[PDB]
């Protein structure tokens, strides 16, 4: 299984864009999918997740700004995100969690986002 990330720039402020992150490989097992961000020098925080149908969060700073959904038939979850602000910007990570008994993650490797 491998995450590969696409979408990231540089956006004005109050600007939009949206990321995907496209799944390659197979598991059969059920996963979760996130998202999160880190600015340069700081923690990697935790923004929204997919898991079953419906089954959405956000972290309270995005609410009603960014969209987390999913294309099943491409693998793929994207986050759209509307009305960037300079706290926005950051690293943009994709990840999941796999799995029942033990759980496998894997971590897509990074998209910027920069807000003017």
């Known amino acids: 299984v491998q995450l590969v990330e696409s979408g990231g720039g540089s956006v004005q402020a109050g600007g939009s864009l949206r990321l995907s992150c496209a799944v390659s490989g197979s598991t059969y097992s059920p996963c979760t999918t996130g998202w999160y961000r880190q600015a340069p020098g700081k923690e990697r925080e935790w923004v929204s997740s997919?898991?079953?149908?419906?089954?959405?969060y956000y972290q309270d700073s995005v609410k009603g700004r960014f969209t987390i959904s999913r294309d099943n038939a491409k693998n793929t979850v994207y986050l759209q995100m509307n009305s960037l602000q300079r706290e926005d910007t950051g690293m943009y990570y994709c990840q999941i969690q796999c799995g029942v008994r033990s759980i496998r993650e894997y971590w897509g490797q990074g998209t910027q986002v920069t807000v003017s």
């Open positions: 997919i898991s079953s149908p419906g089954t959405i």
